[PDB]
Amino acid sequence: EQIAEFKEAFSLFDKDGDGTITTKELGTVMRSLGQNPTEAELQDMINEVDNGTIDFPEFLTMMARKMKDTDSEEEIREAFRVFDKDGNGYISAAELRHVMTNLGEKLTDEEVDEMIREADIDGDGQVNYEEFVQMMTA
Amino acid sequence: PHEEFLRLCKERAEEIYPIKERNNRTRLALIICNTEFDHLPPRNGADFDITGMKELLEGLDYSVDVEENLTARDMESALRAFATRPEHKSSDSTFLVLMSHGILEGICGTVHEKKPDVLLYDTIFQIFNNRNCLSLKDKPKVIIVQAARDAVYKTHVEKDFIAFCSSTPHNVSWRDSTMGSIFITQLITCFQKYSWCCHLEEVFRKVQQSFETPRAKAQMPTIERLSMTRYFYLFPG
Amino acid sequence: RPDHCANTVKNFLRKSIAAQSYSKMFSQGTSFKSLNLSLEAPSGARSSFRSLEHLDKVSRHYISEIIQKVHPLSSDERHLLSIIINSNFNFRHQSNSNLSNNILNIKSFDKIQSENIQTHKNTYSEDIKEISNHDFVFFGVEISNHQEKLPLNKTHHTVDFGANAYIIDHDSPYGYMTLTDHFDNAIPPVFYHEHQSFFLDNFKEVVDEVSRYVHGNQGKTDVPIFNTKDMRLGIGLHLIDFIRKSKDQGFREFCYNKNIDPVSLDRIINFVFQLEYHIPRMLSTDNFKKIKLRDISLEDAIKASNYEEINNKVTDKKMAHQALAYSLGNKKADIALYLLSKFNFTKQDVAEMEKMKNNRYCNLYDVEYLLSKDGANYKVLEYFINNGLVDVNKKFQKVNSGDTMLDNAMKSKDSKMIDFLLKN
Numbered sequence A: 001e002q003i004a005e006f007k008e009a010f011s012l013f014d015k016d017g018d019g020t021i022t023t024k025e026l027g028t029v030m031r032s033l034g035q036n037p038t039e040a041e042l043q044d045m046i047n048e049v050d051n052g053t054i055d056f057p058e059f060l061t062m063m064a065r066k067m068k069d070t071d072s073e074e075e076i077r078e079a080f081r082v083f084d085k086d087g088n089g090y091i092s093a094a095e096l097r098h099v100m101t102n103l104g105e106k107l108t109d110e111e112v113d114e115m116i117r118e119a120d121i122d123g124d125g126q127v128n129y130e131e132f133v134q135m136m137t138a
Numbered sequence B: 001p002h003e004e005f006l007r008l009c010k011e012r013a014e015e016i017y018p019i020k021e022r023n024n025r026t027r028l029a030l031i032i033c034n035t036e037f038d039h040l041p042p043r044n045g046a047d048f049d050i051t052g053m054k055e056l057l058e059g060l061d062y063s064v065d066v067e068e069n070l071t072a073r074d075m076e077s078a079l080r081a082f083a084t085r086p087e088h089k090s091s092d093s094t095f096l097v098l099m100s101h102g103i104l105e106g107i108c109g110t111v112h113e114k115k116p117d118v119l120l121y122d123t124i125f126q127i128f129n130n131r132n133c134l135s136l137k138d139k140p141k142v143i144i145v146q147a148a149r150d151a152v153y154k155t156h157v158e159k160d161f162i163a164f165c166s167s168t169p170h171n172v173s174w175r176d177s178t179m180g181s182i183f184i185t186q187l188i189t190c191f192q193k194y195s196w197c198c199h200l201e202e203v204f205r206k207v208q209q210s211f212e213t214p215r216a217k218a219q220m221p222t223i224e225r226l227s228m229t230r231y232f233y234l235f236p237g
Numbered sequence C: 001r002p003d004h005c006a007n008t009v010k011n012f013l014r015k016s017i018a019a020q021s022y023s024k025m026f027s028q029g030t031s032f033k034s035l036n037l038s039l040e041a042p043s044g045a046r047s048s049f050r051s052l053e054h055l056d057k058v059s060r061h062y063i064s065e066i067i068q069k070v071h072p073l074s075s076d077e078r079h080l081l082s083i084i085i086n087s088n089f090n091f092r093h094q095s096n097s098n099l100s101n102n103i104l105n106i107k108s109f110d111k112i113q114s115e116n117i118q119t120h121k122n123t124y125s126e127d128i129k130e131i132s133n134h135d136f137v138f139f140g141v142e143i144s145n146h147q148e149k150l151p152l153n154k155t156h157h158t159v160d161f162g163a164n165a166y167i168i169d170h171d172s173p174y175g176y177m178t179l180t181d182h183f184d185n186a187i188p189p190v191f192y193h194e195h196q197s198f199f200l201d202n203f204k205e206v207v208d209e210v211s212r213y214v215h216g217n218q219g220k221t222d223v224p225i226f227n228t229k230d231m232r233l234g235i236g237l238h239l240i241d242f243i244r245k246s247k248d249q250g251f252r253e254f255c256y257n258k259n260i261d262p263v264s265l266d267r268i269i270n271f272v273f274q275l276e277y278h279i280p281r282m283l284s285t286d287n288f289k290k291i292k293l294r295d296i297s298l299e300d301a302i303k304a305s306n307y308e309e310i311n312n313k314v315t316d317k318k319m320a321h322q323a324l325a326y327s328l329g330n331k332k333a334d335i336a337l338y339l340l341s342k343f344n345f346t347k348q349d350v351a352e353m354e355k356m357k358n359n360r361y362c363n364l365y366d367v368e369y370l371l372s373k374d375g376a377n378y379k380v381l382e383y384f385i386n387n388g389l390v391d392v393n394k395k396f397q398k399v400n401s402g403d404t405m406l407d408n409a410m411k412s413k414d415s416k417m418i419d420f421l422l423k424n
């Protein structure tokens, strides 16, 4: 879903005011909005206009494609429940450490510690992922 | 310049201040610096300011007594103890370098905030006025201050004074310096270059000219309470 | 796909840490209260993602402003903006400490003060209260699309922060950018610029115009804040605004050169602005570049607790005298105890230190004065008093003449030190 549109960013490269930009400045407009598209991805979506201009209705549909929606809250919760066999709603720091150290993207051991300390507010060594996700999303 | 010193003495004998002979000359200087406060930010980098000022004064045959981190009552007592020093009756001048967090009324003590602890600028002149301090009467009394952020009796009792105040609102908020303070750095710099071919007031004006940089233009050292009836010439030896 | 859930958890925790840092900044910042960009204090110990949301919102605000100020864009301005948007950044952190060990681990002032790690502290009390950016690691910004030697610039706000420069080439997903230092929004004059020769020899009027307060629409104290998505757009728009305001047609023609080289672009950027990038909490990575810009001094190696430079420099006991004096003067009690363990100091060593006019502290202060100035050196004092190196009741002769270590202890209000002096 979209509420606030990217018309202002599109308008900066709209030289004539006709509502179109050249295809070469497509990646520039997206990068100005935080989206970094690959040259290969820029070309396959350029094929939509087969002239060298891109209109805002076509650009607006391009942005929604590479939206990269952040992980939803329930998607966060399910990610924690797959590392909890007992179903008690708790994960030990070591269990969380073994997960993050040996699974997923490789990070430095100091990054894993700063994350575990951030999750264990109590200091008891146990992490209640349910309370934390409910605490972060509010 | 030794030949010029004799030349300036005879040319202007009633227009310049007298100079004691190097024998039987006990010229004293006092440096009062507050770098660490109880309820105020510390003035870091003062180790350089104290050093650069102690060397320049000693290079001018001044015995520097450095006092550091004194409350206002101690600073007042130190100034009174510096005026009662019998070694000033054998001198021609003196220098007062007080460096601390200072409001417009005066310099602040270490304990100073709701509770006040300030040495009023006027109190320094009273301790060294021509009535309370006769040992330095008719003698130039320089006062250099580095602060952060009838009444006709005073016109007559306060003689032979000169102040060169710096009120840069640094407050470790400008937070842009290289191993010391700009005012002290430029003051030493101008004293190295223009002190041999100018009198004391010219050297101060030369320092004010240095602050012509766009961001450092309003950082003008203010001259205050000038009470000198003669031109004070410092000679390089 | 179990790894995907682990990556989800990792991204969630990184986002949480960033939210904490930004909540600290926006809630404990008084300048944020003057403007209406202040945030609520978290009732819980942690903070929700609202802080992060706030950041985004704040970003848009400033973007909006500058857009409305310069929305009619010339072809030259549009081409320059297109150049800036497609430019990548190198982020540089200078230090006199060893932060790399095949892994770069830089930490913020808050995290350092938390673990009580020993190092030099360049943030001050006023920055912490007014901005509260002390849970962020700070970097200077350079253009990265070049083949020249990587440390292009070495001074941020006319300040050299160390010989060891650590450079990263990847943006942080939760860092924020300011056109100047967040606390000091003043562009210093060209007199202090590292690359003054370029602008002085090639340009004329911009030399006077560059010294300014980079502010928003609310006033001088309004320091524009951007996030990683809006960094390049805001930087380009503010650069276009400055170039349009300027009257040196040579500077405008040089900036609007359609085929401008990246080194000249970086010159213009680090001249007109002094970009500053901020990463929450700590930066720990394996992709970094370390460049030793110069040699470090003994005092600078001690203030930064650089044990290896200290071990390289302190080879004899005269160097041990110098190092002990510098350690006392900088409250580096850890380095002082390390030196007392490596070398044996006696009363003769203390006397030779008192005769040491090359050292600033020993020239100004007595050894006893340095031992008793701050409580952070208490243990050293203990070692000096219990082993006979320094005589209690010694009356100071250099600074604060006539006083004793008991008086400095009274001034420090450190109960342990006063008690130890009273008992001995």
Ligand SMILES: NC(=O)c1ccc[n+]([C@@H]2O[C@H](COP(=O)([O-])OP(=O)(O)OC[C@H]3O[C@@H](n4cnc5c(N)ncnc54)[C@H](O)[C@@H]3O)[C@@H](O)[C@@H]2F)c1
Residues within 6 Å of the ligand: C092, C093, C094, C095, C096, C097, C099, C105, C106, C107, C108, C109, C112, C117, C118, C119, C120, C121, C122, C123, C127, C137, C138, C139, C140, C156, C161, C181, C276
């Ligand atoms: N450094 C650089 O380059 C810069 C840039 C820009 C800016 N700056 C400035 O500066 C200031 C601050 O400083 P710095 O950045 O350096 O930070 P600080 O606060 O001081 O803290 C931190 C420190 O410590 C260390 N560290 C880190 N990490 C660590 C560990 N792990 N250990 C030890 N040490 C350390 C570092 O180096 C620094 O010096 C701020 O305010 C500002 F922003 C800087």
